[PDB]
Curated annotation (Swiss-Prot):
<keyword id="KW-0464">Manganese</keyword>
<keyword id="KW-0793">Thylakoid</keyword>
<dbReference type="GO" id="GO:0010242">
    <property type="term" value="F:oxygen evolving activity"/>
</dbReference>
<comment type="subunit">
    <text>PSII is composed of 1 copy each of membrane proteins PsbA, PsbB, PsbC, PsbD, PsbE, PsbF, PsbH, PsbI, PsbJ, PsbK, PsbL, PsbM, PsbT, PsbX, PsbY, PsbZ, Psb30/Ycf12, peripheral proteins PsbO, CyanoQ (PsbQ), PsbU, PsbV and a large number of cofactors. It forms dimeric complexes.</text>
</comment>
<keyword id="KW-0602">Photosynthesis</keyword>
<comment type="similarity">
    <text>Belongs to the PsbO family.</text>
</comment>
<dbReference type="GO" id="GO:0031676">
    <property type="term" value="C:plasma membrane-derived thylakoid membrane"/>
</dbReference>
<dbReference type="GO" id="GO:0010207">
    <property type="term" value="P:photosystem II assembly"/>
</dbReference>
<keyword id="KW-0732">Signal</keyword>
<dbReference type="GO" id="GO:0042549">
    <property type="term" value="P:photosystem II stabilization"/>
</dbReference>
<protein>
    <recommendedName>
        <fullName>Photosystem II extrinsic protein O</fullName>
    </recommendedName>
</protein>
<keyword id="KW-0604">Photosystem II</keyword>
<keyword id="KW-0472">Membrane</keyword>
<dbReference type="GO" id="GO:0009654">
    <property type="term" value="C:photosystem II oxygen evolving complex"/>
</dbReference>
<comment type="function">
    <text>One of the extrinsic, lumenal subunits of photosystem II (PSII), which stabilize and protect the oxygen-evolving complex. PSII is a light-driven water plastoquinone oxidoreductase, using light energy to abstract electrons from H(2)O, generating a proton gradient subsequently used for ATP formation. Required for dimerization of PSII and for binding of PsbQ to PSII.</text>
</comment>
Length: 172
């Protein structure tokens, strides 16, 4: 995924008289864990091609409490990934956030390094939860970066996916 400029700094103010969108959200997994004996255990990524989900986008709606809700409306729908257990079993997964609806804390006056988005997604047989932890904001450009954690049930397994993300926020 893209990265922020090395001098990126500040907060990204949110004008309550305007409406906003996520123009691009890219999720780059760094870890796939699969439940075995009740424990999420690490697996090795086998897929050599890109595993990132990119181009995710949609409105950021305002709720009655000043929180923002991101509604995914377009983007790459899924990425097929294969991971390998320690003992050699290869497991195909579809990494996705299709139909994501995710909200921030109340009283959004600016996107900062303490902003979080939490929500759920669901597509076909997968039901999932994800948290986006913003870690860096470029207030000039609307670019943000952070880490994410998702949990879902893809292909008969319970899977946790974690990684880094990049996003760009802008007025409608
Ligand atoms: Ca944070």
């Amino acid at each position: 995924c893209p990265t922020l400029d090395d001098t990126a700094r500040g907060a990204y103010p949110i004008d309550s008289s305007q409406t906003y969108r996520i123009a691009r959200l890219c999720l780059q997994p760094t870890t796939f864990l699969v439940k075995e004996n009740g424990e999420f255990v690490p697996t090795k990524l086998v897929t050599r091609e890109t595993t990132s989900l990119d181009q995710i986008q949609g409105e950021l709606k305002v709720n009655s409490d000043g929180s923002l809700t991101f509604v995914e409306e377009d983007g790459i729908d899924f990425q097929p990934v294969t991971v390998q257990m320690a003992g050699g079993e290869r497991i195909p997964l579809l990494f996705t956030v299709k139909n994501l609806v995710a909200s921030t804390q109340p009283n959004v006056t600016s996107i900062t390094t303490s902003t979080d988005f939490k929500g759920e997604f669901n597509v076909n047989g997968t039901k999932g939860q994800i948290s986006l932890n913003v870690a860096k904001v470029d207030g000039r450009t609307g670019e943000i970066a952070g880490t994410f954690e998702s949990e879902q049930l893809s292909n008969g397994h319970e899977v946790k996916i974690q990684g880094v993300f990049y996003a760009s926020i802008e007025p409608a």
